[PDB]
CSV table of C-alpha atoms and ligand atoms in Angstrom, one decimal:
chain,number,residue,atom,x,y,z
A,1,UNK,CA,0.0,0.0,0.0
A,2,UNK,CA,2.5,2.2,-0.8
A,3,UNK,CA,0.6,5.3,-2.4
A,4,UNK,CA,-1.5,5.4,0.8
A,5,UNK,CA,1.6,4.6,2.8
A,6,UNK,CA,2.5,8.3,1.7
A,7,UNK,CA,-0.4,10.6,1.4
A,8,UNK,CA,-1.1,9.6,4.8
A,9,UNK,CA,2.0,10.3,6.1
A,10,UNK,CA,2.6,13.9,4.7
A,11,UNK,CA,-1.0,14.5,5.6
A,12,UNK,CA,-0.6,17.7,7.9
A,13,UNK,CA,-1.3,17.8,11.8
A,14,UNK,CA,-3.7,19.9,13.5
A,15,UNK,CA,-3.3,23.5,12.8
A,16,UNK,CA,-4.5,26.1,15.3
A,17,UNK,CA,-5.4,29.6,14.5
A,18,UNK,CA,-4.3,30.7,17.9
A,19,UNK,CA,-7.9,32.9,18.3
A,20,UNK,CA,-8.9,34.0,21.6
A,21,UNK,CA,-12.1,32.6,21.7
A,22,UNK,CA,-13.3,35.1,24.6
A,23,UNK,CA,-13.0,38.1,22.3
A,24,UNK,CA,-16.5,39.2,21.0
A,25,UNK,CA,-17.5,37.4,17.6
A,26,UNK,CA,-16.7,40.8,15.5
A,27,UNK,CA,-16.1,40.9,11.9
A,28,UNK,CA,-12.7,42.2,12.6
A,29,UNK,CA,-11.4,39.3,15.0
A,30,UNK,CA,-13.0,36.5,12.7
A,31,UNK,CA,-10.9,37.8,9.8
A,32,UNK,CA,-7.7,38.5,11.9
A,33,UNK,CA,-8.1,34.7,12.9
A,34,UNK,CA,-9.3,33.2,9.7
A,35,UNK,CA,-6.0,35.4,7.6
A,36,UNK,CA,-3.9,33.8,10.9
A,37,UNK,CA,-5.0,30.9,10.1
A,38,UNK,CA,-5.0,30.9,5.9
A,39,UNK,CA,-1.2,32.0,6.2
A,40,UNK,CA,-0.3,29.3,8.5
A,41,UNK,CA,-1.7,26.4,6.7
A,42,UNK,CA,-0.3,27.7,3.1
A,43,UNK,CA,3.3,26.8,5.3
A,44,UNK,CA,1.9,23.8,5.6
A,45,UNK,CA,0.3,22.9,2.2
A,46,UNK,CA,3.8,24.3,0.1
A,47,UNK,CA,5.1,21.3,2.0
A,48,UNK,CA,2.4,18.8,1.6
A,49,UNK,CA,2.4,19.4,-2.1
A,50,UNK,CA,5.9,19.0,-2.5
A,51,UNK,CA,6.4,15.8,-1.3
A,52,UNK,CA,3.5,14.5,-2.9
A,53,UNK,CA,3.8,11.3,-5.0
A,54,UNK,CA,5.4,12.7,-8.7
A,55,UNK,CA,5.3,16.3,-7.7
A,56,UNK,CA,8.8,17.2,-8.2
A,57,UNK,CA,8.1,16.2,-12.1
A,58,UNK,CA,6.8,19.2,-12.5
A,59,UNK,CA,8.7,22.7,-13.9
A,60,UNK,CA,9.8,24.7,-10.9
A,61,UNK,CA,7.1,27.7,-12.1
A,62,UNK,CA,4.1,25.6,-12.0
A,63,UNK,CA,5.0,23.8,-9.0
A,64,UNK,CA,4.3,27.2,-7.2
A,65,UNK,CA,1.2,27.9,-9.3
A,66,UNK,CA,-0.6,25.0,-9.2
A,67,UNK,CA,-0.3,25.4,-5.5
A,68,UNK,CA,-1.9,28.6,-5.6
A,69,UNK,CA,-4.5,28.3,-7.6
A,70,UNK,CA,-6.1,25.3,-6.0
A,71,UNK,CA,-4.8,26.8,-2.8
A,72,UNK,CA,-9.1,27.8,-1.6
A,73,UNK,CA,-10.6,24.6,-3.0
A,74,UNK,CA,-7.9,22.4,-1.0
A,75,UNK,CA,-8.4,24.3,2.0
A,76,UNK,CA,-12.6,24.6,1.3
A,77,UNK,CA,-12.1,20.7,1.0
A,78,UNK,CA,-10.4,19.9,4.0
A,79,UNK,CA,-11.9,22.1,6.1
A,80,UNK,CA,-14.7,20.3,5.3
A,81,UNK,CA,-13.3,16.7,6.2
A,82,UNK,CA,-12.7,18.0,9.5
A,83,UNK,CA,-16.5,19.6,10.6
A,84,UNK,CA,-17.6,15.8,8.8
A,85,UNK,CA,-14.6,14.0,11.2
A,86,UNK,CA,-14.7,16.4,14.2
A,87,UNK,CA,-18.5,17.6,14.8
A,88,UNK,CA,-20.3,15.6,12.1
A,89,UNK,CA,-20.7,18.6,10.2
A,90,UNK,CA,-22.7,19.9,12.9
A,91,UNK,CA,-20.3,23.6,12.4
A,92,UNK,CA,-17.6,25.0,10.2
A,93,UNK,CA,-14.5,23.3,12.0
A,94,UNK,CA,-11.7,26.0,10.5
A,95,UNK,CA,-9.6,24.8,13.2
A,96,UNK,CA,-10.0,23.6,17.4
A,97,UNK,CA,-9.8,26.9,18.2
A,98,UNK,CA,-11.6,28.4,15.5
A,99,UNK,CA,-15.2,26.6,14.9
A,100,UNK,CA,-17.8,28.6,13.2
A,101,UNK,CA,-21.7,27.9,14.3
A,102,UNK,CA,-24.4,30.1,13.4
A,103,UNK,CA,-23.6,33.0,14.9
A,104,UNK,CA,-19.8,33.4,13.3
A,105,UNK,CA,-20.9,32.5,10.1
A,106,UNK,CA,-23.2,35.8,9.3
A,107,UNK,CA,-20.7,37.3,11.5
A,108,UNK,CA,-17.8,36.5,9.1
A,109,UNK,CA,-20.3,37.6,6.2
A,110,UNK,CA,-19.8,34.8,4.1
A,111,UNK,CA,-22.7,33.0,5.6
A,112,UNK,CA,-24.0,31.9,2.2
A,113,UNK,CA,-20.5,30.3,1.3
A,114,UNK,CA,-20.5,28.6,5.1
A,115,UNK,CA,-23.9,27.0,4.1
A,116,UNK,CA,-22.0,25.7,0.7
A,117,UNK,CA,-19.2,24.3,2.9
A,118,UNK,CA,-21.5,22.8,5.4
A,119,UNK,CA,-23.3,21.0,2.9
A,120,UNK,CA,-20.2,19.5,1.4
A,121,UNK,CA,-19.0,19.0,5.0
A,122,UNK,CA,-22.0,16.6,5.1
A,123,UNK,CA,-21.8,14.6,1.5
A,124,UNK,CA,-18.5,13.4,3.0
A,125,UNK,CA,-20.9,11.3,5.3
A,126,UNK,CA,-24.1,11.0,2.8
A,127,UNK,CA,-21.5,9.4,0.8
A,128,UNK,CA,-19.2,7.6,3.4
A,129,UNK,CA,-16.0,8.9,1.8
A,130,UNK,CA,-13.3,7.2,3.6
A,131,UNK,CA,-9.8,8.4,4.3
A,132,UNK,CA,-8.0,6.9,1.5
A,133,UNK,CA,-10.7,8.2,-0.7
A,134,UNK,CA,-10.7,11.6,1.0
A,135,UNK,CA,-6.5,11.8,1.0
A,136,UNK,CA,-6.6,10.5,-2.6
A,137,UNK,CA,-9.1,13.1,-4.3
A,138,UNK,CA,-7.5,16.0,-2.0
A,139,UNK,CA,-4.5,15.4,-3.8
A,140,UNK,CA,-6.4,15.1,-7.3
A,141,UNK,CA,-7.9,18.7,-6.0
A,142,UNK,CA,-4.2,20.1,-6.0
A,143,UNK,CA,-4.2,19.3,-10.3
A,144,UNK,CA,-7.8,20.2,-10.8
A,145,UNK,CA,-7.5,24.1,-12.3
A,146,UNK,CA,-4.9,25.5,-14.6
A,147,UNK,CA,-4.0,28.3,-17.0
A,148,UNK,CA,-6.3,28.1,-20.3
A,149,UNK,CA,-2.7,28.5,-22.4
A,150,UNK,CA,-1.3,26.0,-20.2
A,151,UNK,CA,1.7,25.4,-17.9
A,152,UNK,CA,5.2,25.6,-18.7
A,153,UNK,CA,5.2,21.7,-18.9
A,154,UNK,CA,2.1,20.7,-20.1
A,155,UNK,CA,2.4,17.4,-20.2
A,156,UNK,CA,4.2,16.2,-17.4
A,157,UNK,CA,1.0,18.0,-15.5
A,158,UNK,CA,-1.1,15.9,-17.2
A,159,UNK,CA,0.6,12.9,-16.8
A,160,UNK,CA,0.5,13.2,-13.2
A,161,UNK,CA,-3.1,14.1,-12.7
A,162,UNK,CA,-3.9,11.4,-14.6
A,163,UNK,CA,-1.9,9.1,-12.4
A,164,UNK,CA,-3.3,10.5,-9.7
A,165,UNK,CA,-7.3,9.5,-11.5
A,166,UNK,CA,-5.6,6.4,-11.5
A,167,UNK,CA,-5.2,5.9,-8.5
A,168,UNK,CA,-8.5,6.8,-7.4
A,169,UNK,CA,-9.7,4.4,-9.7
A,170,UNK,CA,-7.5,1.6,-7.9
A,171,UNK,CA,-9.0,2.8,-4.6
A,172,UNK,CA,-12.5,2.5,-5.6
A,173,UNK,CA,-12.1,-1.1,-7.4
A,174,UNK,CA,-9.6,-2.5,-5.1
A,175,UNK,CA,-13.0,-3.8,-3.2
A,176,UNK,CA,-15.3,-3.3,-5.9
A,177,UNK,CA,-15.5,-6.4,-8.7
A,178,UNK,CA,-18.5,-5.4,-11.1
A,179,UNK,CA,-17.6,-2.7,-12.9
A,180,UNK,CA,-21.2,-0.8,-12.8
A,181,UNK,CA,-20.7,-0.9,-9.1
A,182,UNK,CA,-17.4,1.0,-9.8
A,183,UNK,CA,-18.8,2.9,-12.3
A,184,UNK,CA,-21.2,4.6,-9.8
A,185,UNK,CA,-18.7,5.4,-7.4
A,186,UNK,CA,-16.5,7.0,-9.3
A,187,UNK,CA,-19.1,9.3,-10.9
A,188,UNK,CA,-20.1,10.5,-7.2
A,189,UNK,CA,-16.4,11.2,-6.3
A,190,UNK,CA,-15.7,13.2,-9.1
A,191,UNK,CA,-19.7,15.3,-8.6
A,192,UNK,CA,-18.2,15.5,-5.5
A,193,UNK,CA,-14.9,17.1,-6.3
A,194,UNK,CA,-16.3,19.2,-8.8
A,195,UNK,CA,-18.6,20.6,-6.6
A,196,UNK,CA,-15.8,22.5,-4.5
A,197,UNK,CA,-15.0,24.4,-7.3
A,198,UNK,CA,-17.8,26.9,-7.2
A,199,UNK,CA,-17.3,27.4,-3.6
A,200,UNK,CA,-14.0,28.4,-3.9
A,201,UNK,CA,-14.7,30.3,-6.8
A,202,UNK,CA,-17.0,32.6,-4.2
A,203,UNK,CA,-14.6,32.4,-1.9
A,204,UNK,CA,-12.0,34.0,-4.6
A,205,UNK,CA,-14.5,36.9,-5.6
A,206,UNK,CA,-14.8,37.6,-1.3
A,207,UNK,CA,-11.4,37.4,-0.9
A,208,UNK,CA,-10.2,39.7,-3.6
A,209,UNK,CA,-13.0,42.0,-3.0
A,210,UNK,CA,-12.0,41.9,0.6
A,211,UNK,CA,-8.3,42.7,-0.4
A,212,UNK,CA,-9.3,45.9,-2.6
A,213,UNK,CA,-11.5,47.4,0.3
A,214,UNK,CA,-9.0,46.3,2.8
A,215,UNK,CA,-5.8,47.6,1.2
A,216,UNK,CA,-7.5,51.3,2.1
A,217,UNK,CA,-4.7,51.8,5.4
A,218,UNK,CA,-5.1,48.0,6.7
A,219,UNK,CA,-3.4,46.1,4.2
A,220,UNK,CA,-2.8,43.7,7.3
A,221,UNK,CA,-3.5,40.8,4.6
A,222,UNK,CA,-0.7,38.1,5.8
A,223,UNK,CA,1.9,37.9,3.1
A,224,UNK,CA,1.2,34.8,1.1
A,225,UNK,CA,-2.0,35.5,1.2
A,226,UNK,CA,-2.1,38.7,-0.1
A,227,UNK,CA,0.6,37.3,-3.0
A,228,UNK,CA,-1.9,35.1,-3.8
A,229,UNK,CA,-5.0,36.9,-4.2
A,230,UNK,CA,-3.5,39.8,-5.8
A,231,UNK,CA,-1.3,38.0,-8.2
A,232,UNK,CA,-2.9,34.5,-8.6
A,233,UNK,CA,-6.9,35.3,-8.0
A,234,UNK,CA,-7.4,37.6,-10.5
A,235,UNK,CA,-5.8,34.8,-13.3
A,236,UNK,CA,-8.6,33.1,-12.3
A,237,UNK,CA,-11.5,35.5,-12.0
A,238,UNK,CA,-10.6,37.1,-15.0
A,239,UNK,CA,-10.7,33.6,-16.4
A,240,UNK,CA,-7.3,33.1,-17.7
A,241,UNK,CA,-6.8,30.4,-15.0
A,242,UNK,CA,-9.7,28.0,-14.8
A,243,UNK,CA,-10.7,25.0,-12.9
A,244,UNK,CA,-11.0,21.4,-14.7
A,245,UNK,CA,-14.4,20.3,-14.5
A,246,UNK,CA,-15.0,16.4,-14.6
A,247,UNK,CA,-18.6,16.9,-15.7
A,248,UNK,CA,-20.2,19.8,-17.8
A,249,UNK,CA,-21.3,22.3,-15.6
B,1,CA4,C1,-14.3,36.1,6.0
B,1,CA4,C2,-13.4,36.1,4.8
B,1,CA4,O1,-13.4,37.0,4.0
B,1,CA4,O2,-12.4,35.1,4.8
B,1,CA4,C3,-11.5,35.2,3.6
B,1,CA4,C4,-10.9,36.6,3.6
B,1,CA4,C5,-10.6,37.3,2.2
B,1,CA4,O3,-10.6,37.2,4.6
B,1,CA4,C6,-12.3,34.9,2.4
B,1,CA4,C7,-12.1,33.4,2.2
B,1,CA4,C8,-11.5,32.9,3.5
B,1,CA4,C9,-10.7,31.6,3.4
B,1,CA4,C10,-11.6,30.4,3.2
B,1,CA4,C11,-11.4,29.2,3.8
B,1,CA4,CL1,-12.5,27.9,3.4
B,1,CA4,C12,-10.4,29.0,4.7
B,1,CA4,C13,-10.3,27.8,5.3
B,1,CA4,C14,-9.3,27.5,6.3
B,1,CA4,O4,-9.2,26.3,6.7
B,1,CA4,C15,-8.4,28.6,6.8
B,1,CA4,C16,-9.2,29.7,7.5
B,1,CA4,C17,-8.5,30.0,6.1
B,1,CA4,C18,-9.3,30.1,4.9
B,1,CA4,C19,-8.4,29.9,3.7
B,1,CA4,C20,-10.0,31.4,4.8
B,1,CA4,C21,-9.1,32.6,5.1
B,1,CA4,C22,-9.8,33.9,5.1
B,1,CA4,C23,-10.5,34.1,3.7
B,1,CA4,C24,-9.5,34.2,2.6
């Protein structure tokens, strides 16, 4: 089991966002913890990506933007894994110290997107995605949006996200012996990852949004972050960087 072997072991730890939860549930300290806790992970997901199965295949250049530009999705994703894992999707688990209920999420003012997220949070138990499935099509989220003109190497990018389909595949027959039954699965899987894409495609519009009107004297945006959304964001609003959809949306 040696694919498994590995995307569990570079699967990240816990990650606090080191709020005060005794501080009043203001729009200002939700974001301060939430841009706390965005700058911290992207340590961790550089990381994670990098030692990922076939990775270092890639050109230097895209390495850094393909981890950018799926950056939200993986993040909307996992989040999500942990409400489903830690409170059965009962609230927005951003982090232990950092859960959202009803309150913080029209607090935040994103409660729309929250609702989005907590319904995905709960397909993950709808459809009892396990852990290899989840580790398997997080990774596959990492390859799922590119440049329309492509990368500088093309075709090593697709080489590896097909692998990586692959693989998925192996996962859902490696119990599975009729092929409809396989069939069925994999469709759901890949509704299912697709359907993170117009989340974070909300959550790219807020954020940059949030950046212009924010950039007026607080520009307190953490650094990778605000690289991020003010170089890789617009790509993809603008639509010169798009996501790749398994079905036709
Ligand atoms: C309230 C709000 O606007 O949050 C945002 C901004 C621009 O401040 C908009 C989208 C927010 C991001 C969306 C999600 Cl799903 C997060 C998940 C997660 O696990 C850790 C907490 C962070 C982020 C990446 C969060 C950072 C603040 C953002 C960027």
């Amino acid at each position: 089991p040696i694919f498994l072997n590995v995307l569990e072991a570079i699967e990240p730890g816990v990650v606090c966002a080191g709020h005060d939860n005794n501080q009043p549930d203001s729009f200002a300290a939700l974001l301060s913890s939430l841009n706390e806790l965005g700058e911290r992970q992207l340590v961790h997901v550089v990381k994670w990506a990098k030692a990922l199965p076939g990775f270092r295949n890639l050109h230097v250049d895209d390495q850094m933007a393909v981890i950018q530009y799926s950056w939200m999705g993986l993040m909307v994703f996992a989040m999500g894994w942990r409400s489903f894992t830690n409170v059965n999707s009962r609230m927005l688990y951003f982090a232990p110290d950092l859960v959202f209920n009803e309150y913080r999420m029209h607090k935040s003012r994103m409660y729309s997107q929250c609702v989005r997220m907590r319904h995905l949070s709960q397909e993950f138990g709808w459809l009892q995605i396990t852990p290899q499935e989840f580790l398997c099509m997080k990774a596959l989220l990492l390859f799922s949006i590119i440049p329309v003109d492509g990368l500088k190497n093309q075709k090593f990018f697709d080489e590896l996200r097909m692998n990586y389909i692959k693989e998925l595949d192996r996962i859902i027959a490696c119990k599975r012996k009729n092929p409809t039954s396989c069939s069925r699965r994999f469709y759901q899987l890949t509704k299912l990852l697709d359907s993170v894409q117009p989340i974070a495609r909300e959550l790219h519009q807020f954020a940059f949004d949030l950046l212009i009107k924010s950039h007026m004297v607080s520009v307190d945006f953490p650094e990778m972050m605000a690289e991020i959304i003010s170089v890789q964001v617009p790509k993809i609003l603008s639509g010169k960087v798009k996501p790749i959809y398994f079905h036709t949306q």
